[PDB]
Amino acid sequence: GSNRRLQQTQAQVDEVVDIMRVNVDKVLERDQKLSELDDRADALQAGASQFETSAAKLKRKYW
Amino acid sequence: ARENEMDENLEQVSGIIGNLRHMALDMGNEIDTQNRQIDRIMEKADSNKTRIDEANQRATKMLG
Amino acid sequence: KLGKLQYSLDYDFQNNQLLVGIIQAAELPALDMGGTSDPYVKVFLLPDKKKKFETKVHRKTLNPVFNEQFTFKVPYSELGGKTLVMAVYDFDRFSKHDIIGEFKVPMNTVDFGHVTEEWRDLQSAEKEEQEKLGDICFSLRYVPTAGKLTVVILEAKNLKKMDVGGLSDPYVKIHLMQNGKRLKKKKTTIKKNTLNPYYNESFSFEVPFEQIQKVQVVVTVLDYDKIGKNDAIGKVFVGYNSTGAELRHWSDMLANPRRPIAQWHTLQVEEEVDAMLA
Amino acid sequence: ALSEIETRHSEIIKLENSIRELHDMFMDMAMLVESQGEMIDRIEYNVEHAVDYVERAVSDTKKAVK
Amino acid sequence: NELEEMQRRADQLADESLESTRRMLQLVEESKDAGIRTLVMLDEQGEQLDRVEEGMNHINQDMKEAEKNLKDLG
Ligand SMILES: [Ca+2]
Ligand SMILES: [Ca+2]
Ligand SMILES: [Ca+2]
Ligand SMILES: [Ca+2]
Ligand SMILES: [Ca+2]
Ligand SMILES: [Ca+2]
Ligand SMILES: [Ca+2]
Ligand SMILES: [Ca+2]
Ligand SMILES: [Ca+2]
Fold first, then answer.
1. I need a labelling partner for C71 at 20 to 30 A (CA). Which of A62, C236, C267, E14 fits?
2. Do D33 and E70 touch (CB under 8 A)?
3. Which of B31, B33, B48 is facing E56, going by the closest CB pair?
4. Yes or no: is domain C129-278 CATH 2.60.40.150?
């Protein structure tokens, strides 16, 4: 039918709307987790640099 | 007939919308797996942060 | 040599019809036999695929006079989207009827309120490369240190009809070829009854960076037939002896390590591709 | 009837608006994924520098008890 | 009367619906392209996340070795 094509297409469209909305919110959560992992990564490399400095001190001191 | 061009546009739109449904689904699955992966990476990040901080603490204490 | 054509044009608003006049063509090349040609004029509307009209055959004349008129049942509201095509053909008894020269008038520029009649110099007709076969998009990612080649078959579109009475049953088979020998044959799933199949299927191979410039990747789109040998729709190849967009994508994969590059590619005919595969 | 063609027109425009919402949703998706790609690039940078610094510290601590 | 205007109203509204369908086709095509690019970006970021996790693993092993060396110095 002619109206049935519209109803089917409309149903599929709204379905992909729901799915894509869930996906977009999932990408919001992913953005939060990536900001947190960004901060933890920067702080981690900073502390690793400090531990490299202290390790250099202890090496040049005890060797 | 113009109604024929309209219905053809409707059919093409419908099929493309279905393709967008498959794309949305695979996309969602990949997003979920990458979120779990980010969780693992953050756990390892906290563990390595603890180890590095403790090792630097003892290393600084051994000064002398 | 560019000839001339004298045409008439008028619209009948009462019966909603297009009156096309073929008067005479002038300055025709000496095609066909020696000295004189055999011209006949085929007239048709560009958007419509309706039955093409053709004038009478005039024997041995470079300046033929037709003085014929045709009628096209066309609504005036839709005529804004149409274009009139007048093609002057040459007649050959034992050979293909070579076209002498055609030209087209867009109906959006014609004022049918006043009777139209014009001389127009003919132009050499454009030619199509081949029937529309289709495009296929996929991404290429290469990491030299591990030697892993990730080919993510993304999708395809505008594929040619294969099964009789139906659209297509497409699937993708990638062959890793070298020295004219098939090595690894991978294939994707069958997406039934579609002209725009979607895969998003990742594949992987072993390619050391010492042989990267000596391997060929053959992406072949084929149609599945329930019974019999599955006819092939088209195929492309990247790597050695690659040309144009293929060498472009390969160069992008080489210039971009540890990163995927998504790209479209125009399918070519299996015969010419297999010919380009030395 | 003009009521029939007009209602058909209304349903068609409704489908168009739904497809517009899905469209803007897909574009927003691509944008967010892009920005996340940038942040991921930065995280990868920090992690690599952490790999280098950790490797240096481990080398020195290994060479200290020698 | 308004009979002619009614017929032309039917053809006009039909034209608006048809062009609406054309707009639909363009919009779903653009959505299609943006979706594909989104998928490829997700692949790149995914492999990058894998190599980042493996990097965190190597950091963990190396830092464990340095912890052992510090326990030897102690
Ligand atoms: Ca969360
Ligand atoms: Ca969180
Ligand atoms: Ca001839
Ligand atoms: Ca002849
Ligand atoms: Ca077939
Ligand atoms: Ca078939
Ligand atoms: Ca396009
Ligand atoms: Ca992954
Ligand atoms: Ca992992």
1. E14
2. no
3. B48
4. yes
